[PDB]
């Protein structure tokens, strides 16, 4: 099947996926040209190398984003950065 | 911190650190010279509260991990000696 999606107003106790904007500009990371901002989302809820065996509401599928940024050497980098967007949440 | 250690068959519900041996020789990775076997451990237990991780809910996860040095083949009479990061769980906690 699929993962569950929730808003800030859900009274959902199970492993669910919530919206979240990651703001690089707000972090102050100005070496990042684009994007200044993107939708990352996150996982939260209960479940009835990485060293965790216990079930946990974790991203079960993530997708990359393309970024444009400085290394400060008059060197601008355009790259595909993996695992930046939580597309789906589930337990282990 | 929240560093509890448990052995197997422990009666424990809280976030604890359990033993686990990773055994390259028994697994058959004969290209791995050393270590043949090492203590990796893992985290397990419940966590109460009243970017490429993207998890907010509390979870029993390693709060500290350490590397191991490995000696292995690429099969070209090429033996590689390197520091391999995050291979040993040293401590477990909720965050």
Numbering used by the authors:
A (entry chain B): 1 to 48, 66 to 109
B (entry chain A): 1 to 50, 65 to 109
Q: How does the study describe this entry?
A:
Growth/differentiation factors 8 and 11 (GDF8/myostatin and GDF11/BMP11, respectively) are two closely related members of the activin/inhibin subclass that share ~90% sequence identity in their mature, C-terminal signaling domains and ~52% identity in their N-terminal prodomains. Similar to other TGFβ ligands, GDF8 and GDF11 are disulfide-linked dimers that are initially synthesized as precursors, which are cleaved by furin-like proteases to separate the N-terminal prodomain from the C-terminal mature domain. The ligand dimer elicits signal transduction by symmetrically binding two type II and two type I transmembrane serine/threonine kinase receptors. Similar to other ligands in the activin/inhibin subclass, GDF8 and GDF11 predominantly signal through the type II receptors, activin receptor kinase IIA (ActRIIA; ACVR2A) and ActRIIB (ACVR2B) and the type I receptors, activin-like receptor kinase 4 (ALK4; ACVR1B) and ALK5 (TβRI).
